[PDB]
Scaffold this active site. Structure first.
Site, short mmCIF file in Angstrom:
data_model
loop_
_atom_site.label_atom_id
_atom_site.label_comp_id
_atom_site.label_asym_id
_atom_site.label_seq_id
_atom_site.Cartn_x
_atom_site.Cartn_y
_atom_site.Cartn_z
N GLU A 191 0.30 -0.84 0.18
CA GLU A 191 -0.37 0.19 -0.12
C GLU A 191 0.85 1.28 -0.24
O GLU A 191 1.46 1.56 0.87
CB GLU A 191 -1.19 0.25 0.75
N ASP B 86 -15.52 38.67 -32.96
CA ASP B 86 -16.40 38.25 -32.36
C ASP B 86 -16.10 39.02 -30.57
O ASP B 86 -16.27 38.90 -30.40
CB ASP B 86 -16.21 36.96 -31.58
N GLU C 86 -18.52 39.23 -36.29
CA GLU C 86 -19.64 38.91 -35.76
C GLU C 86 -20.67 40.09 -35.51
O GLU C 86 -20.42 40.99 -34.81
CB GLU C 86 -19.72 38.09 -34.73
N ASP D 52 -15.49 33.14 -26.98
CA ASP D 52 -15.25 34.68 -28.20
C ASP D 52 -13.74 33.38 -29.09
O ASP D 52 -14.22 34.37 -30.11
CB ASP D 52 -15.41 35.71 -27.33
#
Ligand SMILES: [Zn+2]
Ligand SMILES: [Zn+2]
Lengths: 689, 646, 105
Positions: free
Chosen positions: B306, B458, B530, B626
Site C-alpha cells: 500500500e 467576435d 460578427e 469569444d
C-alpha cells in the site's frame, strides 16, 4: 515416444508445402517486373510451376472443403489463400507472357501484369443478412475486413448460419486478392491509422495513466495487420556477389568485374526550400544536413544503377528493361515526397530514416531532451524518484508605423524566447512523446510493409463459430429417437402448464450473479474468447472486448450490463407460444438484438427456476459454438439444453446422449422453438429415473 | 514429461531448387527459401506450432479439444488422408548430408530448452498457478461456475511479475521465452514493444477498494517462491500490524499444499522455502523498515503493498532499493475512490510514460461512467435487495433515483453531473499538445503562406463581466494547413464613449504587427465582424477598422444582406454555418492541420498567460467562448464559402 | 521411382490447359511428385543478389505501380483518396519533424 500422430507429420508436410508455395508466389511477384524477353526464358519453368500448383489442388480440394466446414485453423486458411493466389496470378502472368512474343512491346506488358489498366479489383459486397434487416457493407481496405469480421462476431445471435457462411465465402474472395500474397501489401489497401482488434488489448493490458482507452486508441499505428520486415541492404552488394554467380564458369566473371570497376571509376533535392523552414538560414541547418544526406543517397543509387547497366551489358550482352527502367521516365518527374515515399532500389528504406535521423540529431542539439529519447526508461525512473522524494517530505495611441512596429517587435522578441524556454525547461515529457510518435509514424510509412497475421486468424476464429453451429444443427437430426416439437397438435397444454408452474416462483435474488454471468457468456461471440483461457477473465470482460471493438453507442452498454440486474412475470417471459426465436415484427440491428437479449434472458431465468423447482433435472445450459474437435472427427456434445441461435429450431435438448459423448442411437434429443415445452419434455424424461 | 509431438518430428527431406546462398532453416520444417522469413503469414505459423508443444495441457484452456490445441493444430481426417498420399521429391545425396545436420541442429536448441531447469521453473510456476486457480484460491491440496477468474489488473500484475522473472532467470533464452509466455497468456499477435513493456521495472498499480487486492498477492508469492530458486521477494506494507496477516495467509497455504519441512518461518521476519538439493528462496520482509533490507542481493520484486499513504520514514529504503540493478518495485496501492486521487502517486502521470496503471470505473469526466460499465465486476453490484416498493419506472429514472455515485459510494459532488447527457471531449489531448509545442516560424517561412489574411472579430459590448471579452483571430493558409498569426481577448474599459473604436483600435494594432512581421507577404486581408450581438455596433467596428487601416494589401470586409433587406452590411451573421465550421475545425485540428505561429501576436494575452496556452484552454471546452469562436470562424473563412468583397 | 513433372512433360510447345488435361487431370495420372522449379532469372540475380535486395526492389516497384494507376470518367475510388491523404499526411509530418529539431537547437 517413437510413434508420432499422423496430424503431426501432416502438419509438417503442409508447412513445407506452404513454404514452397510462398517461394513460388515470390518468384511470380518477381517475374511481374522483369523484362519480358528474360521472362520468356523462364516460360517453361513458369508453365511447369503453374501445372504443379494446379495438380496441388484437386487433392487438397476435398480435404480443405471438409476442413472449411469443420473448424478452420490459421494454417489451412493461409494455405487456402496462397494456393488460390498462386493458381490465379501464375496463370494471369503466363497469359500476359504468351500475349507477349505476339505484340512484342514492353510498355504494354507492365500495364497487364502490374495492373495499370484494371478497374481497381479491390472492392466487394458482403451483405451480412441478419434477422430483421440485411445490412450490407463493402470491403475496400484491410482494416475493413477486421471491422466486418468483428461486426459479424458481435451480431452472431442475430445472424442465420447459412446466411453467414455464405457472406464469409464473399470475404475470402476478397482476402485472396488483398492478403492472398502474404508477402507484400499494396499501399492502397493499408490504413495504419485504424486500430486492429489485437492493439485494443495492448492498451487494455499495458499501463494507462488515466487517459481512458477511448482516447488512447486514437494515437496508434496498430502495427499488426501490416508489419515492417526490417529490410537491410549493404552498400557494395553488386561487387560482392559478382565473382560468385550461378553460371559464368568462364573468365567472363573477371572481365565483368573489370567493366564494373571501369564504370565506377568512369531525388529532386532542389525542392526542399519550398517546405516550411525556421530559424537562421546562414550556416548549417537541418534542411542542409537532410539535403546532403539525400544527395549522398542519390549518388549511391546512380552509381549502383550505372554499375548494374554495365554489368548486364558485359555479361549477357543486352541491357535489360525491367519495370524500374521501362517506366523510368516517371521516376524522373517526381516530387520530393512522391520520390521519398517510393524509391531507393539501391539503398534501403531504412537508409532514408538514417539520413533523416542523422540530420535531426547532431552534437549541438542539447544536453537534455536528448537522453530521454536514447533512454525513455531512465526518464520515468528519475521521475518516480523525484515524485517519491517530493511526497516523502495606456494613453497616447500612435497611428504611424514607428510605434506599432516597435511594440510588435518587442512583443515578438519576448514571445520567441518564451516558448523557446518552454521547449527546453518544461515540456520534456510532451516532447519525448511527440518526437517518438512522429518517428514511429514515419518509419511505418517508409519501411517496407509486408503483411500481418491478424486477418487469417480472426477469419478462422469467426468462421469456426458458425461452422460449429451449422454442424450441430445437422448432426442432431441424425440421432436416436427425435422428439421434434415444432409441430404443436397437443403442446399448448404442456407449454401453459409449465409456464404457470414456473412463473409462480421468484427469481431468488441470491442467484442474480450466477445468472448475469451465464447471460454475458451466452451473449458474447466466438472471436473474443477471454473466458476459456487458462488464465480466464470474467465474462463481462470477454463481452466488453467484443462489444467495444465494434464501436457500440454508450447508451447501449447500460442496457447490456444492467439487463438482468432487475429480475415478477414481467420482463421475465417474452416468448409467445411457438415464437421463441422469431424476429418477424422487428427490423434494424439494435432493436433486433434487444429482442435476442430478451429471449436469452427468458431462457436463462426459466432454466434457473426449473432447476430450483424440479430439482431432478440439472439443465446445463450450453452453447454449440464450444466443443472444438479432438484429434479427428469427434465432437462429443455433452447433455444439456443448447440455444443454437437458429430461428428455425433454436432450442435443442440433449437429455441422454451417450456414455462416451458422441450422438448416435442412444441419443434421444428434443427439438423445439419454445422454452417451456422444452423444459416439460426434459422433465418427462429425467424425472422417472 | 517429454512435451508434445511437435519437437520430435522426422526429417521430411522434401527438396529445394534455391541455392544454399539463399535458403534458411525454419525449425520443425526443412530448409526453405529466404523469402519465407520476411513473410509473417508463414514465419508466425511455423513458429507457433512449435511452442504449442512446450505449453503444457493445463494451459491450453478449458475447452480446447481433448488431445491438442484444436484452434492451432487441427487437420480434418479427410485432409490428413489426402496429404498422406502427397509425396515430395527426394533430396540429392550430396545435399541431404548437410541438410539433415542443419535441420536436427536448429531443432536441438528447443529440445535443450525443454530440459533446462531454469525454464522448467517458469513452466512449473505458470502451470501450478493455472491448475491452482482452476479451483479459486483456497486451501486445496493441489493433487454454474466452477472456475475462478483473474480480473484485468490481477492479470497485468501476474504478467509484470512473470515476464520480469523470466527475463532475469533466463537471459540466454530471451527469444524462446517471449514467444512462449505469449502462448501461455493467450496473448499472441502482440508486437514485441507491448511485451517488452512488461520487462521494465517499477510499474505502479492503483486499485479500487478491495477487488481481491490482498487475496491475489498471497498465492502469487506462494507460487513464485516454491517454484523459482534464488529470489528474495521484499514485501513492505503500512504499519506492521497489517503485515502479520500476510505472514499467516502466505504460510497457511504454503504449508497447506506443500510440506511443512520446507516451510522455514520466523515470526515477524523472513519466510524461506527450501528445496531438496541445497537450495533456498526467501521472501525476506522489509516491513521492519530499519535494517535487513538495505543490503540487496536478489530482491528483484519489492512487493510494496500500500503506497497510498507511504509508511513514515520508510521511503529511504525504497529509494535505496531503486538503486539496485535488477529490482522491479511493483508498488501496489489502493485508492478506494474514497479520495479518488492518491496524489502522492497520481501526480506521476504528469511526466512519465508506461509507469502507472489505474483500475478506475469512472473517467476523468464523471458523466461517461458507462465507458467502463461492462467492465465493472458483477460480484460488487449489491443493492438494497429491492428494486422498488411499488413503481413502474424505466432503468434510466431508476438509476437516476438510485445513482449514489453509480457504485453505492459517496463520490465527489459537483463538476460532472450525475445524468451524463451525452457529454464528451472533442479535441484529442495529443493534437492539443502538438498545437502548443510545434509552432512554425512564419517570419522565416513566408514562402509557405497563402497571400491572404483572414480576420474574425467576435465582439462583446459590455464591461465588468467575464463573458464581456471580445475575441479576435487572424489566420491564413500555411501549406494546405491553417496557422494563427494573432489572438486577442479584449475587455472594454467601463463606460467608454467609443467601444467600437476601442475594439477597432485593438484589431488594427494586431493586424499591423502581423503585417510588419511579414512584410510584402499579404495581398489581401479579409475581415469579418460578427453582428449577432449588435448589427449597428458591428458596422461601427468595421467602419473604424476601415478608416484606421487607411493609414500594399487590399482590405476587404465580409458583407451580409440581412433577411428582407437589399443592403450589404459589413458584418457577419453566425447561424447555419456554425456547425460546419466547428465540424471542419475539429477534424483539421485533430489531424495536426491547425497551428500557431512561433511569433504569434497578442497585446491582450501576454502578461498573465501564453496566448496559445490560453486559446487551448478555451478549445478544451468543446463538447467564455469569444476567442474559440473567432479562431474557428476565421479558419472557416480561410477554408471555403461565398466571396467577400471590397 | 516417383518421378517429377519435369522428367514427365519434356515438351513445351502447347497451351497450359492441354497439358493439364493430358498430365495432371487424367485418371491414370500417377501424380507422385511436388517440386517447384526455380523461376528467378539469372539476369536478375546478378543485379539483386540478396533476398533483402530482391524484396526492396519488389516493394519499390509495388509502390510505384500503386502510384501510377491512381494518378470512362469514374475517378470515384476510395483508394486514390487514401493514397492522396497518406501522401499529404506524410509530407506534413516530415515538415514538422525537421523544423522541430531545428528549433530545439
Ligand atoms: Zn478501388
Ligand atoms: Zn494494432
Amino acid at each position: 515416444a517413437a510413434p508420432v500422430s499422423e496430424p503431426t507429420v501432416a502438419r509438417q508436410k503442409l508447412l513445407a508445402l506452404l513454404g514452397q508455395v510462398q517461394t513460388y508466389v515470390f518468384q511470380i511477384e518477381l517475374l511481374r517486373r522483369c523484362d519480358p524477353h528474360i521472362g520468356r526464358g523462364k516460360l517453361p519453368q513458369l508453365k511447369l510451376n503453374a501445372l504443379q500448383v494446379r495438380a496441388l489442388r484437386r487433392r487438397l480440394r476435398p480435404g480443405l472443403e471438409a476442413q472449411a466446414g469443420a473448424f478452420l485453423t490459421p494454417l489451412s486458411v493461409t494455405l487456402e489463400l496462397l494456393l488460390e493466389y498462386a493458381w490465379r496470378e501464375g496463370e494471369r502472368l503466363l497469359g500476359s507472357l504468351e500475349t507477349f512474343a505476339t505484340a512484342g512491346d514492353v510498355a504494354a506488358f507492365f500495364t497487364e501484369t502490374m495492373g495499370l489498366a484494371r478497374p481497381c479489383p479491390y472492392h466487394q459486397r458482403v451483405r451480412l443478412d441478419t434477422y430483421g434487416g440485411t445490412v450490407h457493407m463493402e470491403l475496400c481496405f484491410l482494416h475493413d475486413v477486421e471491422n466486418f469480421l468483428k461486426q459479424l462476431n458481435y451480431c452472431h445471435l442475430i445472424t442465420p448460419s447459412r446466411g453467414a457462411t455464405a457472406a464469409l465465402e464473399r470475404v475470402r474472395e476478397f482476402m485472396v486478392g488483398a492478403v492472398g500474397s502474404g508477402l507484400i501489401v499494396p499501399p492502397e489497401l493499408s490504413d495504419p491509422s485504424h486500430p486492429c482488434a489485437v492493439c485494443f488489448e495492448e492498451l487494455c493490458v499495458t499501463a494507462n495513466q488515466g487517459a481512458t482507452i477511448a482516447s488512447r486508441l486514437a494515437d496508434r499505428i496498430c502495427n499488426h495487420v501490416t508489419q515492417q520486415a526490417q529490410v537491410r541492404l549493404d552498400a557494395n552488394e553488386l561487387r560482392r556477389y559478382l565473382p560468385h554467380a550461378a553460371g559464368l564458369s568462364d573468365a567472363d566473371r573477371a572481365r565483368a568485374l573489370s567493366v564494373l570497376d571501369h564504370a565506377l571509376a568512369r531525388y529532386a533535392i532542389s525542392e526542399l526550400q519550398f517546405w516550411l523552414a525556421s530559424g537562421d538560414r546562414a550556416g548549417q541547418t537541418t534542411m542542409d544536413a537532410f539535403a546532403s544526406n539525400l544527395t549522398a543517397l542519390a549518388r549511391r543509387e546512380l552509381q549502383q544503377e550505372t554499375a548494374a547497366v554495365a554489368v548486364e551489358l558485359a555479361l549477357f550482352g543486352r541491357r535489360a528493361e525491367h519495370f524500374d527502367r521501362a517506366f523510368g521516365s516517371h521516376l524522373a518527374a517526381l516530387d520530393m515526397v512522391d520520390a521519398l515515399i517510393i524509391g531507393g532500389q539501391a539503398t534501403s528504406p531504412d537508409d532514408q530514416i538514417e539520413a533523416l535521423i542523422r540530420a535531426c540529431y547532431d552534437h549541438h542539439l542539447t544536453t537534455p531532451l536528448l537522453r530521454r529519447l536514447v533512454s525513455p526508461e531512465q526518464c520515468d525512473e528519475e521521475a518516480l524518484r523525484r515524485v517519491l522524494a517530493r511526497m516523502g517530505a495606456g494613453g497616447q495611441g500612435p497611428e504611424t508605423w514607428g510605434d506599432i512596429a516597435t511594440q510588435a517587435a518587442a512583443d515578438v522578441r519576448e514571445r520567441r524566447r518564451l516558448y523557446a524556454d518552454r521547449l527546453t525547461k518544461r515540456s520534456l515529457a510532451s516532447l519525448g512523446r511527440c518526437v517518438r510518435e512522429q518517428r514511429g509514424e514515419l518509419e511505418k510509412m517508409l519501411r517496407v510493409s509486408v503483411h500481418g497475421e491478424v486477418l487469417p486468424a480472426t477469419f478462422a476464429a469467426v468462421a469456426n463459430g458458425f461452422a460449429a453451429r451449422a454442424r450441430f444443427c445437422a448432426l442432431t437430426a441424425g440421432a436416436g429417437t427425435v422428439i421434434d416439437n415444432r409441430s404443436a397438435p397437443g403442446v399448448f397444454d404442456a407449454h401453459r402448464f409449465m409456464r404457470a408452474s414456473l412463473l409462480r416462483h421468484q427469481v431468488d435474488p441470491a442467484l442474480l450473479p450466477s445468472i448475469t454471468h451465464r447471460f454475458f457468456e451466452l451473449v458474447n461471440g466466438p472471436l473474443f474468447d477471454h473466458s476459456t483461457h487458462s488464465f480466464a477473465q470474467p465474462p463481462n470482460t470477454a463481452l466488453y472486448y467484443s462489444v467495444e471493438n465494434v464501436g457500440l453507442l454508450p447508451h447501449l452498454k447500460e442496457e447490456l450490463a444492467r439487463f438482468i440486474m432487475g429480475a415478477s412475470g414481467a420482463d421475465w417471459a417474452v416468448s409467445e407460444f411457438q415464437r421463441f426465436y422469431c424476429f418477424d415484427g422487428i427490423s434494424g440491428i439494435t432493436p433486433t438484438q434487444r429482442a435476442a437479449w430478451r429471449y436469452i434472458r427468458e431462457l436463462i431465468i426459466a432454466t434457473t427456476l426449473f432447476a430450483s423447482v424440479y430439482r431432478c433435472g440439472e439443465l446445463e445450459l450450453r452453447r454449440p459454438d464450444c466443443s472444438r474437435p479432438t484429434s479427428e472427427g469427434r465432437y462429443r456434445y455433452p447433455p444439456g439444453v443448447y440455444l443454437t441461435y437458429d430461428s428455425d429450431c433454436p432450442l435443442v435438448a440433449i437429455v441422454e446422449s451417450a456414455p462416451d459423448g458422441c450422438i448416435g442411437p442412444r441419443s434421444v434429443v428434443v427439438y423445439d422453438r419454445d422454452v417451456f415445452s422444452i423444459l416439460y419434455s426434459v422433465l418427462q424424461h429425467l424425472a422417472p429415473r | 514429461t517429454m512435451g508434445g509431438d511437435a519437437l520430435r518430428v522426422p526429417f521430411l527431406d522434401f527438396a529445394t531448387a534455391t541455392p544454399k546462398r539463399h535458403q534458411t532453416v525454419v525449425p520443425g520444417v526443412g530448409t526453405l527459401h529466404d523469402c519465407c522469413e520476411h513473410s509473417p503469414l508463414f514465419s508466425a505459423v511455423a513458429r507457433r506450432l512449435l511452442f504449442n508443444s512446450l505449453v503444457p495441457a493445463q494451459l491450453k484452456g478449458r475447452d480446447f479439444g481433448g488431445d491438442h490445441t484444436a484452434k492451432l493444430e487441427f487437420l480434418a481426417p479427410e485432409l490428413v488422408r489426402a496429404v498422406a498420399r502427397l509425396r515430395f521429391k527426394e533430396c540429392a545425396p550430396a545435399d541431404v548430408v548437410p541438410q539433415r545436420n542443419a535441420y536436427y541442429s536448429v531443432l536441438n536448441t528447443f529440445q535443450a530448452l525443454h530440459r533446462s531447469e531454469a525454464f522448467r521453473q517458469l513452466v512449473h510456476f505458470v502451470r501450478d498457478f493455472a491448475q491452482l486457480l482452476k479451483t479459486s484460491f483456497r486451501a486445496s491440496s493441489l493433487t454454474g461456475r466452477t472456475y475462478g477468474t483473474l480480473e484485468l489488473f490481477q492479470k497485468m500484475i501476474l504478467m509484470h511479475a512473470t515476464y520480469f522473472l523470466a527475463a532475469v532467470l533466463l537471459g540466454d533464452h530471451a527469444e524462446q521465452v517471449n514467444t512462449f509466455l505469449r502462448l501461455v497468456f493467450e496473448i499472441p499477435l502482440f508486437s514485441d514493444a507491448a511485451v517488452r513493456h512488461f520487462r521494465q521495472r517499477a510499474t505502479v498499480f492503483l486499485v479500487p477498494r478491495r477487488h481481491g487486492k490482498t487475496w491475489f498477492l498471497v498465492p502469487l508469492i506462494a507460487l513464485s517462491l516454491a517454484s523459482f530458486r534464488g529470489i528474495k521477494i521484499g514485501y513492505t506494507a503500512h504499519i506492521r500490524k497489517a503485515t502479520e496477516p500476510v505472514f499467516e495467509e502466505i504460510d497457511a497455504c504454503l504449508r497447506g499444499w506443500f510440506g511443512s519441512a520446507r516451510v522455514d518461518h520466523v515470526k515477524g521476519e523472513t519466510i524461506s522455502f527450501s528445496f531438496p538439493d541445497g537450495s533456498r528462496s526467501t521472501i525476506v520482509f522489509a516491513s521492519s523498515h530499519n535494517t535487513n533490507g538495505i543490503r540487496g542481493q536478489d530482491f528483484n520484486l519489492l512487493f510494496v503493498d500500500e503506497a497510498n499513504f507511504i509508511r513514515p520514514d520508510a521511503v529511504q529504503t525504497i529509494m535505496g532499493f531503486l538503486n539496485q540493478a535488477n529490482c522491479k518495485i511493483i508498488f501496489v496501492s489502493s485508492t478506494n475512490t474514497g479520495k479518488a486521487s492518491t496524489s502522492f502517486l497520481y501526480n506521476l502521470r504528469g511526466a512519465a510514460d508506461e509507469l502507472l496503471n489505474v483500475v478506475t470505473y469512472i473517467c476523468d469526466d464523471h458523466m461517461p461512467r458507462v465507458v467502463t460499465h461492462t467492465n465493472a465486476t458483477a460480484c460488487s453490484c449489491y443493492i438494497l435487495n429491492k428494486p422498488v416498493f411499488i413503481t413502474m419506472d424505466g432503468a434510466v429514472r431508476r438509476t437516476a433515483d438510485l445513482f449514489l455515485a453509480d457504485s453505492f459510494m459517496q463520490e465527489i459532488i459537483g463538476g460532472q453531473a450525475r445524468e451524463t447527457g451525452d457529454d464528451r471531449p472533442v479535441l484529442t489531448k495529443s493534437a492539443g499538445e502538438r498545437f502548443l509545442l510545434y509552432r512554425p516560424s512564419t517570419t522565416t517561412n513566408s514562402g509557405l503562406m497563402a497571400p491572404d489574411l483572414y480576420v474574425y472579430v467576435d465582439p462583446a459590448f459590455t464591461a465588468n463581466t467575464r463573458a464581456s471579452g471580445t475575441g479576435v483571430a487572424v489566420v491564413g493558409r500555411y501549406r494546405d494547413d491553417y496557422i494563427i498569426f494573432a489572438l486577442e481577448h479584449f475587455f472594454l474599459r467601463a463606460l467608454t464613449g467609443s467601444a467600437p473604436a476601442d475594439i477597432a483600435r485593438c484589431v488594427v494594432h494586431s493586424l499591423t504587427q502581423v503585417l510588419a512581421l511579414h512584410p510584402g507577404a499579404f495581398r489581401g486581408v479579409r475581415v469579418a465582424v460578427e453582428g449577432n450581438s449588435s448589427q449597428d455596433s458591428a458596422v461601427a467596428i468595421a467602419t473604424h477598422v476601415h478608416t484606421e487601416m487607411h493609414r500594399g494589401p487590399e482590405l476587404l470586409f465580409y458583407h451580409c444582406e440581412p433577411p428582407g433587406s437589399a443592403v450589404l452590411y459589413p458584418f457577419f451573421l453566425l447561424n447555419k454555418q456554425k456547425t460546419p465550421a466547428f465540424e471542419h475545425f475539429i477534424k483539421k485540428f485533430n489531424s495536426g492541420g491547425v497551428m500557431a505561429s512561433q511569433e504569434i501576436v497578442s497585446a491582450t494575452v501576454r502578461l498573465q498567460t501564453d496566448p496559445v496556452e490560453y486559446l487551448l484552454e478555451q478549445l478544451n471546452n468543446l463538447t467564455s467562448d469569444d476567442l474559440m469562436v473567432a479562431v474557428i470562424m476565421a479558419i472557416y473563412l480561410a477554408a471555403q464559402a461565398g466571396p467577400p468583397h471590397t | 521411382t516417383l518421378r517429377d513433372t519435369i522428367p514427365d512433360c519434356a515438351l513445351r510447345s502447347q497451351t497450359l490447359e492441354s497439358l493439364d488435361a493430358r498430365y495432371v487431370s487424367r485418371d491414370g495420372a500417377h501424380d507422385a511428385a511436388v517440386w517447384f522449379e526455380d523461376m528467378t532469372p539469372a539476369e536478375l540475380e546478378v543485379v539483386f543478389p540478396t533476398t533483402d535486395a530482391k524484396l526492396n526492389y519488389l516493394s519499390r516497384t509495388q509502390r510505384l505501380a500503386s502510384l501510377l494507376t491512381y494518378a470512362t470518367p469514374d475517378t470515384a475510388c476510395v483508394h486514390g483518396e487514401l493514397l492522396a491523404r497518406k501522401r499529404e499526411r506524410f509530407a506534413a509530418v516530415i515538415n514538422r519533424f525537421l523544423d522541430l529539431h531545428q528549433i530545439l537547437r
